[PDB]
Structures are given as C-alpha cells and as structure tokens.
Design a protein. Structure first.
Ligand SMILES: [Zn+2]
Length: 182
C-alpha cells in the first residue's frame, strides 16, 4: 500500500453511481481522520478532476501520477518530511494521501501555488487538512477562489449550474495532458 504511482493501463473504468459517490465522501473524511490520528501533522489529500461517472481512467492516472511527483518535489523543495504516503482508487478515482511534517498554512499556500504554477495544476484537487481536521481554503487567506477549468468564473459557479458539457471537460484533460507529455 505504501507505493504511489498508479499504472495507467491497469485502470478499472469502474462506473461510480451517484449514491456510491455520495457514500465515499464520508469514508474519505473518516479515512482522513485516521491518518491525522496516526500521524498528527497536516495531511494532503489529493484527487484528480474526474468529471464523468468513470473516474479511474488511463487519463486520470497519468494526471494523478504527475501530481505525485510534484507533491514529492514540493515536499523536498520546502524541506518538509513526508511521514506517510499512500495511494488508492476510490469512488472519486485516483486518490493519494501524504502526512507531511510541515506548518499547515505554509503547506496549503505551497499547494495553492502548485495548482497555479504547474502545467497540469488545474486537474488537481489538492486539499490540505490540519491535525484538528480543519480543511484549509483559499478563502481563509482572502485569495481568489479556484477558477473553472473551462472559463473565467469560479469552479463552484460552473459546477453548480452545469454550465459546461462533460465531453468538453474531458477533452480539455486529454488536451492539457498532450501538451505536457509531448
Ligand atoms: Zn466555467
């Protein structure tokens, strides 16, 4: 379970139902709290944008794997010890967790900076939890909210009102993926 890179051709193409997606958000939270108790340091909880009902695809793995490398190089850059790291596939698709012995805020700012500066940064959902279980946000620091993959507006406004077509979100993912993996 320690190992972290998810081989893309072994993707499950598991079609997740709506109530299976709604159930897994509760297992996530519970799993997140077990890591915080086993290692009381901030935790990065990392999933990939996976718009459809099939969220464990070859595309989503290649994207998850690029994030793994970048999370580790960020840890090394900031001089932050990873105490535990694991990956899995859940109802939200590829998922990773890293217990990092760092200040929670620095960690959240670093991962914000990563989502912006990295060529694939907008396919990553890099959450950061404090040991108390508080999920840190851009709003805690009066930062602009995460913007939508497809236009200028905030992600939440475009996801609430299904503004953008699912094929467009997917085609963008392939497109960003192909501009990097050149
Ligand atoms: Zn939009």
């Amino acid at each position: 379970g320690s190992h972290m890179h998810l081989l893309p051709e072994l993707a499950s193409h598991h079609a997740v139902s709506i109530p299976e997606l709604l159930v897994s958000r509760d297992e996530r939270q519970a799993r997140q709290h077990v890591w915080l108790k086993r290692h009381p340091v901030p935790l990065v909880s990392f999933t990939v944008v996976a718009p459809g009902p099939i969220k464990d695809s070859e595309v989503t793995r290649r994207i998850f794997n690029h994030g793994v490398t970048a999370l580790r190089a960020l840890a090394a850059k900031q001089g932050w010890q990873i105490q535990e790291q694991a990956a899995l596939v859940s109802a939200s698709g590829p998922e990773g967790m890293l217990s990092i012995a760092a200040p929670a805020r620095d960690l959240k700012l670093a991962t914000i900076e990563l989502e912006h500066s990295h060529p694939l940064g907008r396919l990553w959902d890099i959450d950061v939890l404090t040991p108390e279980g508080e999920i840190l946000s851009r709003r805690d620091y009066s930062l602009p909210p995460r913007r939508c993959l497809l236009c200028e507006q905030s992600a939440a406004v475009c996801a609430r009102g299904k503004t953008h077509q699912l094929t467009d979100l997917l085609n963008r993912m392939e497109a960003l993926l192909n501009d990097v993996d050149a």
